Scaffold this active site. Structure first.
Site, short mmCIF file in Angstrom:
data_model
loop_
_atom_site.label_atom_id
_atom_site.label_comp_id
_atom_site.label_asym_id
_atom_site.label_seq_id
_atom_site.Cartn_x
_atom_site.Cartn_y
_atom_site.Cartn_z
N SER A 88 0.48 -1.35 -0.03
CA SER A 88 -0.15 -0.06 0.28
C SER A 88 0.48 1.00 0.39
O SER A 88 2.09 1.06 0.47
CB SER A 88 -0.87 0.08 1.14
OG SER A 88 -1.55 -0.98 1.05
N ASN A 113 4.25 -10.05 9.91
CA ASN A 113 4.02 -8.46 10.56
C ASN A 113 3.23 -7.60 11.17
O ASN A 113 2.28 -7.40 11.48
CB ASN A 113 4.34 -8.22 8.71
CG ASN A 113 2.92 -7.76 8.32
OD1 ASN A 113 2.71 -6.47 8.53
ND2 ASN A 113 1.70 -8.84 6.93
N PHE A 117 2.15 -0.15 6.82
CA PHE A 117 2.09 0.98 6.14
C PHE A 117 3.16 1.94 5.95
O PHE A 117 3.11 3.70 6.20
CB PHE A 117 0.54 1.67 5.59
CG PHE A 117 -0.46 1.29 5.85
CD1 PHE A 117 -2.09 2.31 5.85
CD2 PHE A 117 -0.57 -0.04 5.48
CE1 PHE A 117 -2.71 1.39 5.36
CE2 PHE A 117 -1.84 -0.27 4.16
CZ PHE A 117 -2.77 0.15 5.06
N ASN A 185 -2.41 -3.74 10.40
CA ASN A 185 -1.99 -2.39 11.67
C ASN A 185 -1.77 -1.06 11.40
O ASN A 185 -1.37 -0.69 11.91
CB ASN A 185 -0.68 -3.17 11.14
CG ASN A 185 0.08 -4.72 11.00
OD1 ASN A 185 -0.40 -5.59 12.22
ND2 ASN A 185 -0.50 -5.25 9.77
N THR A 247 -8.25 -12.59 0.31
CA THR A 247 -8.41 -11.82 1.65
C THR A 247 -6.89 -10.54 2.17
O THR A 247 -5.83 -11.48 1.81
CB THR A 247 -8.38 -12.42 2.87
OG1 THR A 247 -7.54 -13.24 3.25
CG2 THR A 247 -9.87 -13.19 3.03
C1 LIG Z 1 5.51 -8.41 5.07
C2 LIG Z 1 3.60 -8.26 4.41
C3 LIG Z 1 3.51 -6.80 4.03
C4 LIG Z 1 2.35 -6.95 3.16
N1 LIG Z 1 1.87 -5.51 3.17
C5 LIG Z 1 0.66 -5.22 2.39
C6 LIG Z 1 0.20 -3.51 2.26
O1 LIG Z 1 0.99 -3.00 1.88
N2 LIG Z 1 -1.51 -4.00 1.53
C7 LIG Z 1 -2.12 -4.72 1.69
O2 LIG Z 1 -2.89 -4.44 0.78
N3 LIG Z 1 -1.65 -6.34 1.98
C8 LIG Z 1 -0.47 -6.82 2.42
N4 LIG Z 1 0.24 -7.32 2.73
C9 LIG Z 1 -1.00 -8.81 2.65
C10 LIG Z 1 -0.79 -9.46 1.15
O3 LIG Z 1 -0.51 -8.66 -0.07
C11 LIG Z 1 -1.39 -10.48 1.16
O4 LIG Z 1 -3.26 -9.80 1.38
C12 LIG Z 1 -1.84 -11.55 3.01
O5 LIG Z 1 -0.31 -11.76 3.03
C13 LIG Z 1 -1.76 -13.16 1.95
O6 LIG Z 1 -0.95 -13.24 1.26
P1 LIG Z 1 0.08 -14.80 1.40
O7 LIG Z 1 -0.70 -15.61 2.97
O8 LIG Z 1 0.26 -15.40 0.09
O9 LIG Z 1 1.06 -13.46 1.83
C14 LIG Z 1 0.99 -8.17 2.87
C15 LIG Z 1 1.43 -9.43 4.06
C16 LIG Z 1 2.97 -9.61 4.22
C17 LIG Z 1 3.15 -10.93 4.27
O1 LIG Z 2 1.71 -2.48 6.15
C1 LIG Z 2 1.25 -3.18 6.88
O2 LIG Z 2 1.98 -3.07 8.82
C2 LIG Z 2 0.14 -4.41 6.80
C3 LIG Z 2 -0.46 -3.53 5.71
C4 LIG Z 2 -1.35 -4.76 4.77
O3 LIG Z 2 -2.46 -3.94 4.76
N1 LIG Z 2 -1.56 -5.42 5.73
C5 LIG Z 2 -0.80 -6.40 6.57
O4 LIG Z 2 -0.58 -7.83 6.55
N2 LIG Z 2 0.60 -5.67 6.51
#
Ligand SMILES: Cc1cc2nc3c(=O)[nH]c(=O)nc-3n(C[C@H](O)[C@H](O)[C@H](O)COP(=O)(O)O)c2cc1C
Ligand SMILES: O=C(O)c1cc(=O)[nH]c(=O)[nH]1
Ligand SMILES: O=C(O)C1=C(C(=O)Nc2ccc(-c3cccc(OC(F)(F)F)c3)cc2F)CCC1
EC number: 1.3.5.2
Length: 360
Positions: A88, A113, A117, A185, A247
């Protein structure tokens, strides 16, 4: 390291990297290498999907969070992703929470995590995307769309204005925008509030010139009550929201977690989140009568994981955590296995499998 062998990366390279660097440093190095093309499968027509006003070479994309500031987009396409989502991004730059803010749970093939943002801000990302705007125009036309995930500042007093600003600044540079209201978060990031927020977001979007008018999607949590999901579906249909991303990470801690850091605060991702996400996709697909495109995300690490979300109702899927454990090779692995499974199950292509579980 340069070949692309799944076993080498999973059994040697990645494990060694984690033993040398803390999780955040490892991620930063990952972004650097990806942006530089330092990476180790040909997409068949079967994997092609058309949705959100675009063609997607394959349905496997990189989830938001890996490339928060849009620094490794081209490297990510090179890695094999059918589409890339950055963010994001917050209006103003902000550092996020203090370190440590990311934790590995090896025994659970999961991650927790609480970045909060951390973002370079709209202005910096805008210029970064503008520098390759035409290149992206050709990639998109070529079946490799770009998504931009929008967030809001910690000290923002007008949530809706933060997103509106994101729509105005980055909307012209994206194929689709994501209104991220599911981050666990950020302070207190609802039917009433959602309707008001999305109405403003869509109005801002409709005010952009045609060729710079992106689809608008809402990214939701896996921890919603039945009422919440019910209301979201209603608002989505009421306002004409183009799609949903299901999600984000979960604030729940499923029974069975073995990792020593299981009790750290933050959103949990990876295998323990997989089925909770698939089920959320299944429910949202049904509540929207299969008329609202869904991008399924949450614990995807294999072709089977991807197909389960597709059959549950997702038109596209994304992964992130699996990449942190298996490395770049997981992308081809997922696509190869998905293709084989589609054939074995009688589907002419990905499109035929979308929502298949609901018509049985
Ligand atoms: C370290 C980290 C940072 C993330 N940052 C964001 C973010 O800035 N915006 C967002 O919409 N999702 C964020 N996510 C969530 C992922 O886009 C995703 O929705 C979620 O991790 C589930 O997918 P996965 O199990 O394949 O990781 C983040 C996930 C992780 C692990
Ligand atoms: O930036 C983060 O802390 C963050 C944002 C988000 O949308 N999802 C997530 O897992 N972490
Ligand atoms: O990505 C993350 O956010 C996190 C972690 C992580 O290890 N991430 C990585 C590391 C290297 C990654 C890459 C990228 C590109 C190429 C790689 O192979 C190499 F190193 F040989 F060049 C390895 C990809 C990731 F997603 C650890 C937990 C958080």
């Amino acid at each position: 390291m340069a070949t692309g062998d799944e076993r080498f990366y999973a059994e040697h390279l990645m494990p060694t990297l984690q033993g040398l660097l803390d999780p955040e440093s490892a991620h930063r190095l990952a972004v650097r290498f990806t942006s530089l093309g330092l990476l180790p499968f040909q997409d068949s027509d079967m994997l092609e999907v058309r949705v959100l006003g675009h063609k997607f070479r394959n349905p496997v994309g990189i989830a938001a969070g890996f490339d928060k500031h849009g620094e490794a987009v081209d490297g990510l396409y090179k890695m094999g992703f059918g589409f890339v989502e950055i963010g994001s991004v917050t209006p103003k730059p902000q550092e996020g929470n203090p370190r440590p803010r990311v934790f590995r749970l090896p025994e659970d093939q999961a991650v927790i995590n609480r970045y909060g943002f951390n973002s370079h801000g709209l202005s910096v990302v805008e210029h970064r995307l503008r520098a390759r705007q035409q290149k992206q125009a050709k990639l998109t036309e070529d079946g490799l769309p770009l998504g931009v995930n929008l967030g809001k500042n910690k000290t923002s007093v007008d949530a809706a204005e933060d997103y509106a600003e994101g729509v105005r600044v980055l909307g012209p540079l994206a194929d689709y925008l994501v209104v991220n209201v599911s981050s666990p978060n950020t302070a207190g990031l609802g039917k009433a509030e959602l309707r008001r927020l999305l109405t403003k977001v869509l109005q801002e979007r409709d005010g952009l010139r045609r060729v710079h008018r992106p689809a608008v999607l809402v990214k939701i949590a896996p921890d919603l009550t039945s009422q919440d999901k019910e209301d979201i579906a209603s608002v989505v249909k009421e306002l004409g929201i183009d799609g949903l991303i299901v999600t984000n990470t979960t604030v729940s801690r499923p029974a069975g977690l073995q990792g020593a850091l299981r009790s750290e605060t933050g959103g949990l991702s990876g295998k323990p989140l997989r089925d909770l996400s698939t089920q959320t996709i299944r429910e949202m697909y049904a509540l929207t009568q299969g008329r609202v495109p869904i991008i399924g995300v949450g614990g995807v690490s294999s072709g089977q994981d991807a197909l389960e979300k597709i059959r549950a109702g997702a038109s596209l899927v994304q992964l992130y955590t699996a990449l942190t454990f298996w490395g770049p090779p997981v992308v081809g692995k997922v696509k190869r296995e998905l293709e084989a499974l589609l054939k074995e199950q009688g589907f002419g292509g990905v499109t035929d499998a979308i929502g298949a579980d609901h018509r049985r």
